[PDB]
């Protein structure tokens, strides 16, 4: 993947996170489970929604009747009408096919980017209070209860609150 | 001392939708939407809410001239398009040329 | 048939907001563009990599 996260350093997906595109799995003393990150998911949904509606609604065709009728002495204009009909067919077919190919590629990259960034937002909060153990997981150098966990998902993790305890276990 | 852990991850599900990308064919995605309308109702419908004029076994020439085989056709006071059948050949039962026939057909289409 | 439509083809009516169709090139109405494609499926979710 363009950014290295999806099918990358985070090897597989989670059939257990059913409520969102990206999110978190935690295990601490009081329990364990998945929780979707609601904010980043809604943003991506909004982004992708805008994209689909864009591809659909920017085509605003007028009322037309395609068929044309020509007699046996009007073959040249009949073939002109066919050249027209065939030209549009080739154009629309090429562009529709390529457009989808390109946006599908861009859509997957976008998800890849969002996961990478989610990971980076967490790494940046924790700094050295946890150890990067790969596969997208962080192992805390201090006890992390549900309150602590929620601060991390919300982005209000208190690095100095746990910094002393962590440094002890890190040493 | 196995510390508490928090992992980032992403949704996967049971979906089998595949899509093509510029770099890779048949990529399975968790969801996708179709842009290509590829089904019809097998019916000829009202357009703008107005029924078409159906000519049965007559063609436009036969209908508009009043070919005796077209007498049984009902003709509304308006219609949104015209339908002929591929076997509709009750036309000019007395042979000859219908001058500017196709122009007339286009004029009468709706 | 006693049905309404906004786009009629020789082999059946089409009721759709989608921008493309492979039913028939000869249509009447406010219709989707005819294309030769057999599949124009746009991805919205993500690559599916279950366990």
């Amino acid at each position, epitope marked *: 993947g363009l950014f290295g996260a999806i099918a990358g350093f985070i090897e597989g997906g989670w059939t257990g996170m059913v409520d969102g595109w990206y999110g978190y799995h935690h295990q601490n003393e009081q329990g364990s489970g998945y929780a979707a990150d609601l904010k980043s*998911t809604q943003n991506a949904i909004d982004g992708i*929604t805008n994209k689909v509606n864009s591809v659909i609604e920017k085509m605003n065709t007028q009322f037309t009747a395609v068929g044309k009728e020509f007699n046996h002495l009007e073959k040249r204009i009949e073939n002109l009408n066919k050249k027209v009909d065939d030209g549009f067919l080739d154009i629309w077919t090429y562009n529709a096919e390529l457009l989808v190919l390109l946006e599908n590629e861009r859509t997957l990259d976008y998800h890849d980017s969002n996961v990478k960034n989610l990971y980076e937002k967490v790494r940046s909060q924790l700094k050295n209070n946890a150890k990067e153990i790969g596969n997208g997981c962080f192992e805390f150098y201090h006890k992390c209860d549900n309150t602590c966990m929620e601060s991390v998902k919300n982005g209000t993790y208190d690095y100095p609150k746990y910094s002393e305890e962590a440094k002890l276990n890190r040493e | 001392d196995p510390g508490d852990t928090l992992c980032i991850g992403y949704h996967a599900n049971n979906s089998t939708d595949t899509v093509d990308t510029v770099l890779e064919k048949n990529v399975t995605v968790t969801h996708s939407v179709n842009l290509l309308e590829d089904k019809h109702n097998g019916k000829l419908c009202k357009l703008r809410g107005v029924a078409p004029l159906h000519l049965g076994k007559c063609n436009i020439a036969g209908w508009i001239l009043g070919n005796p085989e077209c007498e049984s056709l009902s003709t509304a006071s308006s219609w949104s398009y015209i339908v002929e059948t591929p076997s509709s050949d009750n036309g000019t039962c007395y042979p000859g040329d219908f001058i500017d026939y196709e122009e007339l057909r286009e004029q009468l289409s709706s | 048939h006693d049905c309404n439509t906004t786009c009629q083809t020789p082999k059946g009516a089409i009721n759709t907001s989608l921008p493309f169709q492979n039913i028939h090139p000869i249509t009447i109405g406010k219709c989707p563009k005819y294309v030769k494609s057999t599949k124009l499926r746009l991805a919205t*979710g993500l690559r599916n990599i279950p366990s």
Partner: antibody
């Protein structure tokens, strides 16, 4: 402006199918979940399923597994509830309903309801 | 699963009086993913409470939710005449979404 507009009330014979529409009229369709809730005459409310067109595929309740399908037309801003597990005790009022303030892509609660489409299954 | 039974099926109270409806769950309930609706006959529901105690905008102050786990309560502190209707509780921690049976508050007389 944000309103859901249900299809007309309908009467279908037993065994056959019904399809109820629900046109949103506000904002860009697709980034919110639409739920389908059903209410038999003088009865509780049961949730059949719902869709968020873009987030993922429809999710259904087992009661209607194989008898119902929900789809959405992303351009026309419309969701469809198709039911053809048809009997006489499928006669009810059918509501489509959504959440209004985000995040609303998932099936949660519901601020905004249609007026309902009453559907009577009778030969 | 996670089915919610409401108690009592009907509640007879005269105006001005405290009404407290309850809603019990077959399984615990994720934080506070419980809404409360109000249906008057012939209409679709109005959302009263979400979260578990968060009042929906529009809803007058007399309505207040509370509770957690498998026990929730909806309290109406002064029944006005408008307030007489059926009240359904709904959960949304997990699909399938399930409602309550509903409690009908009626006018005691």
């Amino acid at each position: 402006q944000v309103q859901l507009v249900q299809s007309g009330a309908e009467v279908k014979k037993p065994g056959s199918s019904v399809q109820v529409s629900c046109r949103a009229s506000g904002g860009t369709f697709g980034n919110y979940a639409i739920n389908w809730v059903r209410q038999a005459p003088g009865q509780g409310l049961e949730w059949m399923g719902g869709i968020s067109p873009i987030f993922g595929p429809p999710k259904y309740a087992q009661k209607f597994q194989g008898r119902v399908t929900i789809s959405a037309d992303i351009s026309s801003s419309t969701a469809y509830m198709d039911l053809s597990s048809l009997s006489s005790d499928d006669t009810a009022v059918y509501y489509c309903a959504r959440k209004l303030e985000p995040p609303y892509y998932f099936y949660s609660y519901m601020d905004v309801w249609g007026k309902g489409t009453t559907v009577t299954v009778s030969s | 699963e996670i089915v919610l039974t409401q108690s009592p099926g009907t509640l007879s109270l005269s105006p001005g009086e405290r009404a407290t409806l309850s809603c019990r769950a077959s399984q615990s309930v994720s934080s506070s993913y419980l809404a409360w609706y109000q249906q008057k006959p012939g209409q679709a529901p109005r959302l009263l409470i979400y979260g578990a105690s968060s009042r929906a905008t529009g809803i007058p102050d007399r309505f207040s939710g509370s509770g957690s786990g498998t026990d929730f309560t909806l309290t109406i502190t002064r029944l006005e005449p408008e307030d007489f209707a059926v009240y359904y509780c709904q959960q949304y921690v997990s699909t399938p979404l399930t409602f309550g049976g509903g409690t009908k508050v009626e006018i005691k007389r």
